[PDB]
Amino acid sequence: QAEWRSWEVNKRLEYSLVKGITEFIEQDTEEARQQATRPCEVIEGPLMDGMNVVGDLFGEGKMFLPQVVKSARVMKQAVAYLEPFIEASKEQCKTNGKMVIATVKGDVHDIGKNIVGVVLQCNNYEIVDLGVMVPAEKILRTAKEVNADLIGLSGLITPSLDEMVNVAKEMERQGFTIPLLIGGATTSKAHTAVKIEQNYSGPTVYVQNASRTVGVVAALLSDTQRDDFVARTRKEYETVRIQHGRKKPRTPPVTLEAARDNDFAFDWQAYTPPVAHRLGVQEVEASIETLRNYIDWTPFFMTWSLAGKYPRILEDEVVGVEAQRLFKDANDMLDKLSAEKTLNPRGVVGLFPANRVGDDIEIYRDETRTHVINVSHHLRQQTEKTGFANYCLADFVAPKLSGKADYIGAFAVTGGLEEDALADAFEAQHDDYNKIMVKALADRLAEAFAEYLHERVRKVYWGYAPNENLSNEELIRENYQGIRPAPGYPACPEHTEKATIWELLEVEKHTGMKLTESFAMWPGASVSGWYFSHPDSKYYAVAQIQRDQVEDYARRKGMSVTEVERWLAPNLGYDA
Numbered sequence: 001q002a003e004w005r006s007w008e009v010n011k012r013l014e015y016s017l018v019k020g021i022t023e024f025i026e027q028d029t030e031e032a033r034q035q036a037t038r039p040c041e042v043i044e045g046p047l048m049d050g051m052n053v054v055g056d057l058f059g060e061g062k063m064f065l066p067q068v069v070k071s072a073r074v075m076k077q078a079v080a081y082l083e084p085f086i087e088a089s090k091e092q093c094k095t096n097g098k099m100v101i102a103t104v105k106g107d108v109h110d111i112g113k114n115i116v117g118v119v120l121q122c123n124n125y126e127i128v129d130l131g132v133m134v135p136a137e138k139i140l141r142t143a144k145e146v147n148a149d150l151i152g153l154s155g156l157i158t159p160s161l162d163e164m165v166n167v168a169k170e171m172e173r174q175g176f177t178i179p180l181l182i183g184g185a186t187t188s189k190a191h192t193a194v195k196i197e198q199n200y201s202g203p204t205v206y207v208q209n210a211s212r213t214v215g216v217v218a219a220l221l222s223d224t225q226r227d228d229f230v231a232r233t234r235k236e237y238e239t240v241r242i243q244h245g246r247k248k249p250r251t252p253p254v255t256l257e258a259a260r261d262n263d264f265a266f267d268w269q270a271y272t273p274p275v276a277h278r279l280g281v282q283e284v285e286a287s288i289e290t291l292r293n294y295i296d297w298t299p300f301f302m303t304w305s306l307a308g309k310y311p312r313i314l315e316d317e318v319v320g321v322e323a324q325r326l327f328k329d330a331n332d333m334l335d336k337l338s339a340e341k342t343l344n345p346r347g348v349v350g351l352f353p354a355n356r357v358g359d360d361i362e363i364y365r366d367e368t369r370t371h372v373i374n375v376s377h378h379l380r381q382q383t384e385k386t387g388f389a390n391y392c393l394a395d396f397v398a399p400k401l402s403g404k405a406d407y408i409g410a411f412a413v414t415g416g417l418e419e420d421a422l423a424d425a426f427e428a429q430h431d432d433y434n435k436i437m438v439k440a441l442a443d444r445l446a447e448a449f450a451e452y453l454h455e456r457v458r459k460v461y462w463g464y465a466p467n468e469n470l471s472n473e474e475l476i477r478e479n480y481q482g483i484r485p486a487p488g489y490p491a492c493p494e495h496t497e498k499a500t501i502w503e504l505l506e507v508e509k510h511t512g513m514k515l516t517e518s519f520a521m522w523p524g525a526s527v528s529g530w531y532f533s534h535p536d537s538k539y540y541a542v543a544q545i546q547r548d549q550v551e552d553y554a555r556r557k558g559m560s561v562t563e564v565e566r567w568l569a570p571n572l573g574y575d576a
């Protein structure tokens, strides 16, 4: 027996979808297609009734994202078996609308996209996923090729915002009318209103997450709301476009010269930077077993729309149960991935003699410090400050003109070069659950590798904190000496400098990890950055800089003032 196996066929479907039961979806939907006069009645019928149940169930707080994707696995697997019958008997089945989704050119991270997409499919909307590093050309060409009502763009890094504005300007040059939805971690409501919208006659809507998205595609794609929604979006996008537009960013900029005279104050003659126990470039690798203990699960829960900090989240009266099951699954997969060695985290680390020179860091070939093998550039905050200094990462390395011997470190790690293969496999068998799982887990593994390696550097490779012994909780709170800023973050926005790290460490040749034109890393599950030992070194944002630094930086980088303005776009204190 089973009780639910004694219910109506289209009732067992609703049950299997909601509960995510896969075992009987095959030999249960084939029976429902017989009752129906055509293949599209099962999809448009019981198959969607259940998803409609998942939808309100979800909206009430009795169901969460992790479970929802599990329902999709049953649906998408029901369609898969029922697609040979549909096409071989025509009819494209009624849908709520079509959409072309893709990760901007140059970018590579797509976890958030995969989520937005799956959720939309759970609302019958049809989604065509072009993947990542997709050229604006194929994007607009695909949307036309298969008549799409909406185009969705994703972007993780700053350089993506440029390619986005590009897509909008092209949609205008080509006459597109359909709405443009821009989302991602790099996308904000202010940028969409101040830099994206105005370049397109059609609607342009920014949407935080994958839940309020189905709500936008709903009103924006309807008839009784479509018009009112755009007008509201426009007005608002103006009260903000003119909000930021003028009423000038109160916080008077400063001469790059004055900033430099306010550089971090420190008596270097009295201080002696720890000497690295080791110098050189080392190919590193850690097992999943060693890295699990360094994993910070909080961001992992965020990724699945489960609010709460680990481990307290496991006891939450609302999502604790589901967080537990999601946690158990992740660990189940790690056990397999580790035992089979199907996913292998790897990286490279390096320490070099170094000294500051202006706002940059010279890196020497050896301890004689006679030959400079490379330069780390870095930018300086260009804002008036009282009580504080105009920070520049270089400031934390001993000045060349101090005679003090200092150093600088670099690293590049990835959760595994197999991330993509693995994702594709699940992608094949229409398993969105662990397709997302494996990538989210590869990401945790990468960040875990960065925490582990930073510890090894502090305790061994660099060796200034050999006796240091912190708990994972203690590591996450960064209650240790030194920092590891990563190109792209606030204190070092210029993404191009990742080239410096890749040159010093010869990353690609050593690990396989790659770099794109937009300077995104591959695999997606990968991290890279620097290492500073100074006990006074901390994170901060370079924020908005002026024309003077853009030019000085241009000279130093050997780039046009034009090229550097594109790369520091989000940090420019003036207009483009």
Ligand code: B12
Residues within 6 Å of the ligand: 101, 108, 109, 111, 112, 113, 115, 116, 151, 152, 153, 154, 155, 156, 157, 158, 159, 181, 182, 183, 184, 185, 186, 207, 208, 209, 210, 211, 213, 299, 302, 303, 304, 443, 444, 446, 447, 486, 487, 488, 489, 490, 519, 520, 521, 522, 523, 524, 525, 526, 527, 528, 529
């Ligand atoms: C841990 C984390 C990571 C992860 C894993 C999870 C992830 N990305 O989703 C990993 C380890 C891969 C990572 C690394 C890097 N990161 Co990171 N990361 C973070 C952090 C702390 C959390 C983001 C998170 O977990 N997102 C949750 C996921 C599920 O959400 P999401 O991607 O944003 O997607 C949601 C929505 O935005 C939406 N959406 C997504 N796409 C679309 C598309 C459409 C069309 C629509 C309608 C909606 C929509 O739907 C999603 C589900 O709700 C943030 C800070 C922050 N809070 O934003 C930075 C942040 C994204 N990282 C940043 C940077 C700099 C980097 C690195 C280059 C760092 C380095 N190592 O040098 C690399 C990129 C690696 C590469 N391959 O190129 C930046 C800045 C962007 C910039 N200036 O380029 C951020 C904002 C940090 C900051 N404060 O400056 N990242």
Ligand SMILES: Nc1ncnc2c1ncn2[C@@H]1O[C@H](CSCC[C@H](N)C(=O)O)[C@@H](O)[C@H]1O
Residues within 6 Å of the ligand: 296, 299, 447, 476, 484, 485, 486, 489, 490, 491, 492, 529, 539, 540, 541
């Ligand atoms: N202002 C800043 N400038 C440069 N890098 C920064 C920064 N703020 C954060 N970072 C980088 O991002 C890291 C924090 S995010 C990584 C740890 C987090 N618990 C997780 O698992 O996702 C910092 O350690 C540093 O590597």
